[PDB]
Amino acid sequence: KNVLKIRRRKMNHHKYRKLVKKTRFLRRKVQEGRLRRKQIKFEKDLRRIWLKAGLKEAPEGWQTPKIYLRG
Amino acid sequence: ATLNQMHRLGPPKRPPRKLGPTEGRPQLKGVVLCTFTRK
Amino acid sequence: NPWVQIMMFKNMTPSPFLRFYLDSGEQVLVDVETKSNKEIMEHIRKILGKNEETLREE
Amino acid sequence: ELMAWNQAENRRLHELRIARLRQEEREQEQRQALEQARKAEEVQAWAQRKE
Amino acid sequence: DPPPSTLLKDYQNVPGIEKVDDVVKRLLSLEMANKKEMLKIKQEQFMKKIVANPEDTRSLEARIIALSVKIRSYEEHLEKHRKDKAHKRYLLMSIDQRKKMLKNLRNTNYDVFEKICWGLGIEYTFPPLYYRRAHRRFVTKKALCIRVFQETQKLKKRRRALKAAAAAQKQ
Amino acid sequence: VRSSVHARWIVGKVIGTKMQKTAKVRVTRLVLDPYLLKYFNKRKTYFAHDALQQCTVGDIVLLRALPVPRAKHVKHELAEIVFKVGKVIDPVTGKPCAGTTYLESPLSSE
RNA sequence: CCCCACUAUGCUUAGCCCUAAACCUCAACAGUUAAAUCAACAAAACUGCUCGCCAGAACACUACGAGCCACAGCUUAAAACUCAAA
RNA sequence: ACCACGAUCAAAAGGGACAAGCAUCAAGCACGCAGCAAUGCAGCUCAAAACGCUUAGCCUAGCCACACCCCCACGGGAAACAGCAGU
Ligand SMILES: [K+]
Ligand SMILES: [K+]
Ligand SMILES: [K+]
Ligand SMILES: [Mg+2]
Ligand SMILES: [Mg+2]
Ligand SMILES: [Mg+2]
Ligand SMILES: [Mg+2]
Ligand SMILES: [Mg+2]
Ligand SMILES: [Mg+2]
Ligand SMILES: [Mg+2]
Ligand SMILES: [Mg+2]
Ligand SMILES: [Mg+2]
Ligand SMILES: [Mg+2]
Ligand SMILES: [Mg+2]
Ligand SMILES: [Mg+2]
Ligand SMILES: [Mg+2]
Ligand SMILES: [Mg+2]
Ligand SMILES: [Mg+2]
Ligand SMILES: [Mg+2]
Ligand SMILES: [Mg+2]
Ligand SMILES: [Mg+2]
Ligand SMILES: [Mg+2]
Numbered sequence: 001k002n003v004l005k006i007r008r009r010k011m012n013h014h015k016y017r018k019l020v021k022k023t024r025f026l027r028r029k030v031q032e033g034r035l036r037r038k039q040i041k042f043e044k045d046l047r048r049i050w051l052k053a054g055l056k057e058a059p060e061g062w063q064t065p066k067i068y069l070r071g
Numbered sequence: 072a073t074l075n076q077m078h079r080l081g082p083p084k085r086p087p088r089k090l091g092p093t094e095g096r097p098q099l100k101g102v103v104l105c106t107f108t109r110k
Numbered sequence: 111n112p113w114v115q116i117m118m119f120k121n122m123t124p125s126p127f128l129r130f131y132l133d134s135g136e137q138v139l140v141d142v143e144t145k146s147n148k149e150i151m152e153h154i155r156k157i158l159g160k161n162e163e164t165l166r167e168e
Numbered sequence: 169e170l171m172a173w174n175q176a177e178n179r180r181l182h183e184l185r186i187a188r189l190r191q192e193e194r195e196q197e198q199r200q201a202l203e204q205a206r207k208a209e210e211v212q213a214w215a216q217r218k219e
Numbered sequence: 220d221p222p223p224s225t226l227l228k229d230y231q232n233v234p235g236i237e238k239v240d241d242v243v244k245r246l247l248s249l250e251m252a253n254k255k256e257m258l259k260i261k262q263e264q265f266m267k268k269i270v271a272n273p274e275d276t277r278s279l280e281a282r283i284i285a286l287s288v289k290i291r292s293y294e295e296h297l298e299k300h301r302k303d304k305a306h307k308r309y310l311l312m313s314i315d316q317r318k319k320m321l322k323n324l325r326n327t328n329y330d331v332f333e334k335i336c337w338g339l340g341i342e343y344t345f346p347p348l349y350y351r352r353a354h355r356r357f358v359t360k361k362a363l364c365i366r367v368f369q370e371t372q373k374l375k376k377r378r379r380a381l382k383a384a385a386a387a388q389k390q
Numbered sequence: 391v392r393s394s395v396h397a398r399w400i401v402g403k404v405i406g407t408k409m410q411k412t413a414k415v416r417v418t419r420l421v422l423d424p425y426l427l428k429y430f431n432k433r434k435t436y437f438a439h440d441a442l443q444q445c446t447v448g449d450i451v452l453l454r455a456l457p458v459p460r461a462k463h464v465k466h467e468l469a470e471i472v473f474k475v476g477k478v479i480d481p482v483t484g485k486p487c488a489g490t491t492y493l494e495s496p497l498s499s500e
Numbered sequence: 501c502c503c504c505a506c507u508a509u510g511c512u513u514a515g516c517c518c519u520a521a522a523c524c525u526c527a528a529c530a531g532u533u534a535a536a537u538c539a540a541c542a543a544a545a546c547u548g549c550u551c552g553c554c555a556g557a558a559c560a561c562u563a564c565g566a567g568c569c570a571c572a573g574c575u576u577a578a579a580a581c582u583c584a585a586a
Numbered sequence: 587a588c589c590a591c592g593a594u595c596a597a598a599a600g601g602g603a604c605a606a607g608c609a610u611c612a613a614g615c616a617c618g619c620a621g622c623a624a625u626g627c628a629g630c631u632c633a634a635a636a637c638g639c640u641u642a643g644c645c646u647a648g649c650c651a652c653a654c655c656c657c658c659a660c661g662g663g664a665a666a667c668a669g670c671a672g673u
Contacts, residue, residue, distance in 0.1 A: 006521085013561065017572080024572045031571070038566095046360060049615065050367045054374065059366035067355040070571070073550065078423050078430055079634080083555090084607070087641090116420050117401050119450070122473060123480045124490050125185075131399050131452065135469075138174060141181045141482050153177070157170040182483070189497055218233050326448060328488040329476025345447065349632075351612070354567055364615045371616085396602035410620040410627060433634065437619080458600075461619070463630080465601070565610050577610070 035068045042067065130158060221260045223250035228259045254292070262288045269338035280331055283320045287339050289313055317341075395455035395465045401472065402436060402453065404445045412464060413438045413445040415453060439467040448475035 020027065043064050050058055058064075072080070093099055128140040128150070138158065142150050230236060230247040249257050262285055266273040270280045293310040297303060321343055325332040336343055353361075397417075406414030415436045420429040438445075438453045439460060445451060445468060454469035478487055486493040 003521095008558090009561065012559095016560095016562070020572050028571075042356060042359075046363045049360075049364055050370075053367050053371050053615085055367065055370055059363070059370045062363065062366055064363075065359060067359055070569095072553090074426055074428055075430075075550080076552090078426055078428065082425065087607075112422075115400055115417070117418060119473070121490050122478055123482070123487055124492055125480070125482050127482050129481065131401070133398060135454075136171075138171065139178065139481055140174065141178050143181065143185070143482075153174075157174045178482070185483070186496060186500070189495070193495075193497070215233065218229055219235075325476050327476060327478075328493075329474075331488075332476055349613085351633085352567070356567090357613070361613090361615080368616060394600050406629095408627090408629060409618070410629095412619055414630095431634085435631095455601090463618075566612105 039066060039068050128154065130154075221249060221257060221264070223248060225249045225260055227252060227256055228263060258288050258292055261291075265338060269334055279320060279324045279327070280335055283317060283324065283335055284339065286313055286317050286320065287341070290317065393455045393457050395457075395459065397436070397453075397466070398455045399469075400436065400453050400466070402451060404447050404449050404451055405435075407440075407443070407445055407447055409437070411440055411443060412461075413440045413451065413468060415451060415466075417453075436466050437461070437464040439464055441468075444468075445471065446475050449473055 046064055047058075125141070125143040127142055130138040130140070132138065140150075140153060140157075142153075145153070224244070226236065226244070226247050227249070236244075236247070245251055249260065263273070265284045265288070266281060269284060270278065272278070275281060276285075290310065290313050293306055293313065296306050297310060300306065321332065321335070321341065324335065325343065332343075335341065400415075400417045402415035402417035404413050405416045408414075415438050416433050417436055418431040418433045421432040422429055436453060438451065439456070449471055450473035451468055452470040452472055453466040455466055456464075459465040476488075479485070480487045480492070483492075483496045485496050485498075
């Protein structure tokens with residue numbers, strides 16, 4: 001068989017990798033912002049729980065950890 | 072597929088029919104903005 | 111008999127048997143070892159199946 | 169009457185089972201006798217080789 | 220482990236083995252043999268200690284005992300060879316096959332299942348119903364939901380005493 | 391004899407004993423697949439009152455409906471342990487068995 | 501593309517990463533060689549049973565979401581517009 | 587007619603059953619049990635699809651739901667044809 005289908009995929013992946021290289025600094029700023037919103041969306045999910053259970057503050061001694069940071 | 076697989080998958084789910092430029096309607100009213108020619 | 115629970119059990123005992131649980135609480139043990147499938151169907155029809163008259167009436 | 173007839177059919181099948189099981193023990197014992205003989209020779213042969 | 224002076228399973232029942240020279244006893248002992256010979260002696264001890272017929276090797280009991288000896292050999296092997304991925308696979312597969320044997324023995328002969336567990340020191344465990352990744356977001360939310368439950372329980376008990384106290388005052 | 395519970399007699403397998411005096415029982419029924427016209431097991435969970443806590447996970451039990459439910463999910467009581475897990479008694483002969491093999495021969499008591 | 505020099509790298513140790521035309525592109529178990537042998541080519545045609553997967557092309561080994569020691573990554577993976585073919 | 591220890595009819599309550607699409611909605615977060623109570627145990631649902639989002643009146647001798655909105659209607663917004671004819 002010919003490799004014409006492979007050749008299409010080859011070009012797509014090449015142009016994709018090149019696009020990522022050309023915009024890797026903008027993508028890093030966007031990725032950082034998404035992780036911040038992801039952490040906020042996570043904190044809201046937990047706060048909803050204790051508030052809907054009748055508590056007014058977080059359980060004594062509870063600190064929501066940062067589960068999306070590289071550290 | 073096997074009978075167990077066909078039972079587990081169920082009947083085939085066919086995607087809801089797409090709506091064309093009329094949004095599933097025979098005609099639409101419009102206001103002309105500009106006229107031109109296309110090749 | 112869509113409303114009768116039928117449950118199957120493999121290789122739990124040395125010989126095959128059918129057991130029926132009735133609403134009164136009575137249990138009917140039917141030994142089926144050595145019997146053909148047609149004889150099993152005729153046996154349980156006789157002891158626990160509705161006769162042709164009872165069905166004609168319904 | 170049908171429950172009693174079914175209980176009698178089970179008793180009949182039980183007597184046929186016990187007769188079938190007795191014939192299987194006599195055959196099982198014959199085989200079990202030969203295997204012990206064969207197994208005893210293989211032990212004596214294996215024991216002599218080790219000795 | 221059996222003492223090194225233990226004789227091989229093949230030479231333990233030959234007549235007159237106790238009157239031979241000490242050198243001949245060393246040459247027919249575990250000290251002068253490979254580890255596989257020591258595992259055959261371990262398998263024999265477990266059989267007499269557990270199974271009703273120590274000569275029946277095809278029973279589900281004997282297979283569980285044989286596989287348990289292999290499992291212990293893999294664990295000792297991997298204690299010294301921690302990057303041996305081939306034997307790590309054999310251990311995990313063997314543990315899964317003993318659980319599959321123990322399941323079938325528990326379903327068929329519970330009295331024998333109990334003696335196998337006591338004799339071999341196996342703590343039978345029922346499988347978990349759901350195997351799913353406990354990722355960070357799940358492990359944190361589940362922890363918070365347990366803390367919220369514990370706090371709600373405490374508050375509900377302090378709403379029993381205050382109501383109890385006020386009711387007594389009316390009297 | 392009347393009861394408000396729909397399922398009057400059901401057989402199932404005990405799958406849980408972590409509740410006090412309550413056995414969690416998986417009951418399977420055959421349900422016809424309308425398109426394939428093949429029967430497939432459909433399983434449902436029932437809580438059964440077990441006063442003596444004699445049920446073990448894996449044994450086949452017979453459940454009887456209560457006159458009225460005793461709890462939100464407890465609508466049945468343990469009526470009989472049909473097949474004790476690993477301790478099955480052959481109903482046809484009355485002798486103990488381990489799978490398809492007898493542990494005591496029926497010829498012992500003739 | 502050809503010649504020379506030299507580095508990351510190929511090696512060891514301790515951790516990661518988890519991708520290949522990872523393809524013998526031919527799933528596991530059991531069975532058959534008779535009937536119709538059989539689109540073509542390839543590595544002859546089939547049966548039982550089970551799981552996995554597939555449903556025009558392209559968009560797309562992409563977007564978003566989610567998970568991940570991965571932060572120019574991997575896994576899962578669409579839709580709109582477009583074509584009457586591929 | 588009134589009574590029928592009843593029949594018919596049919597609420598509430600209890601048990602069971604009961605739409606479609608999406609798993610890129612995979613976890614839900616108290617969803618269980620025992621006890622006369624006190625209280626104790628830590629369970630309950632879920633890849634055989636829970637929880638969630640979106641779409642839709644339905645299984646048509648008819649049925650369900652709604653009746654301007656705030657699911658409800660003390661109260662409030664506000665002043666109501668989704669009764670007929672009509673605009
Ligand atoms: K691949
Ligand atoms: K290849
Ligand atoms: K309303
Ligand atoms: Mg070529
Ligand atoms: Mg392209
Ligand atoms: Mg170098
Ligand atoms: Mg080297
Ligand atoms: Mg290769
Ligand atoms: Mg492949
Ligand atoms: Mg496979
Ligand atoms: Mg084959
Ligand atoms: Mg396609
Ligand atoms: Mg790739
Ligand atoms: Mg990607
Ligand atoms: Mg992304
Ligand atoms: Mg009602
Ligand atoms: Mg109801
Ligand atoms: Mg998406
Ligand atoms: Mg609507
Ligand atoms: Mg109006
Ligand atoms: Mg209203
Ligand atoms: Mg009108």
